Ligand binder design. Structure first.
Ligand SMILES: O=C(O)c1ccccc1O
Ligand SMILES: O=C(O)c1ccccc1O
Ligand SMILES: O=C(O)c1ccccc1O
Ligand SMILES: O=C(O)c1ccccc1O
Lengths: 213, 211
């Protein structure tokens, strides 16, 4: 049944999603359905809405404003933005003050087709105009960049904690008031009742849902 | 007038390019041109050739055979593909044999609009069939994924070497016959004499060219 499938599922997610969702998913699949193949793609890859409609993309994961309307969507968890910097930073402290946040230099991330791109506008509207020497499209490059510079960054908490040891970095709670990050699972009405889709949806829900309350 | 420039330069490069190029560039810029901004994008974002022509993208860095004719270029350095897997993998050995390579499960990297996209085809044509359990679009997530699974991957060596300690990975010379990876810097002829472009190109050559 589930054990036997050799179906390939295609999943849209960010690079954080790849490092976060893939290892436990692979571990679960080796226990439960060891022949299933998984392919990922970034939320910006083509025509996400069209590709979910046609069935080329089975599921989408993340903070995804594109799909806020015509799609089924289930919340997996919430987490916050934190500030991150190298463990031996010459001046950065935790907790970091707004003043210090505005004094330091930043690397920014433009996560295309995600809601993370609201961050710069939200800070700007609060009067926090960062000295941002570098802007990159995506998140994982942030680890090595912070490891070998005095830059700081604003990043999702669940990504940050995964960088602390590998890249020798520390986090601070974020001095600015930023909304919570809702990481959701999305699917198109067409596959609402497809057995294989429901099974993979249920697995994501089981593996990744916040113990709510 | 480098020190006073507030120019934003738009650079096309991979996730590997960002981790490798950006920290020394960041350090040089703080010292020579602290008001310059650098914005990156992937080689696959929009269409590279037109954007370099328009000055939408100033410079491209990486393995980019589509720019190999009709663009200016300088070689920065060369390196090879290697096989990478977690240090305590139950069976994977270094050096890995081609037989073992064909037996183990892989994480593939599709790698669009770079030369790395060709790996699947050189292997497939040579008759080296891989059991591809997981496919991702880009390289940089391979580090965390190998660390926490039993998969193996084929990856650029200079990238692989930066993963070894952070993620507890080992490498092997690659059992298959694969081409060298030439990492070049490219620009369009139109900006050949643009002063800010010349200045930044020359900074990349200074910091990264082994030639
Ligand atoms: O921002 C995301 O896409 C994300 C994905 C998985 C886990 C945490 C995250 O912030
Ligand atoms: O349609 C499938 O191949 C399938 C896959 C996983 C679980 C249940 C299924 O029917
Ligand atoms: O593949 C790349 O684009 C690359 C870039 C910088 C250093 C090593 C690399 O392989
Ligand atoms: O001439 C410019 O516009 C310029 C900009 C940045 C760095 C060096 C430069 O000459």
């Amino acid at each position: 049944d589930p054990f036997a499938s050799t179906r390939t599922f295609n999943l849209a997610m960010t690079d954080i999603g790849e490092m976060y969702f893939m290892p436990p998913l692979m571990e679960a699949l080796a226990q439960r359905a060891p022949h299933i193949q998984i392919s990922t793609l970034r939320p910006n890859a083509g025509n996400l809405k069209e590709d979910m409609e046609s069935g080329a993309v089975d599921l989408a994961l993340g903070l995804l404003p594109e799909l806020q309307t015509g799609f089924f969507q289930r919340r997996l968890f919430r987490h916050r933005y934190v500030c991150m910097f190298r463990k031996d930073h010459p001046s950065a402290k935790s907790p970091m003050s707004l003043k210090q946040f505005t004094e330091l230099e930043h690397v920014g991330v433009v996560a295309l087709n995600t809601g993370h791109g609201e961050v710069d506008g939200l800070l700007e509207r609060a009067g926090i105009k960062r000295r941002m020497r570098l802007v990159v499209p995506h998140f994982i490059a942030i680890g090595p960049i912070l490891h070998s510079t005095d830059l700081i960054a604003t990043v999702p908490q669940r990504f940050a904690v995964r960088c602390e040891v590998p890249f020798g970095l520390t986090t601070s709670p974020h001095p600015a008031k930023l909304p919570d990050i809702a990481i959701n699972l999305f699917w198109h009405a067409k596959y609402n009742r497809d057995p294989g889709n429901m099974w993979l949806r249920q697995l994501f829900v089981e593996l990744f849902s916040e113990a709510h309350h």
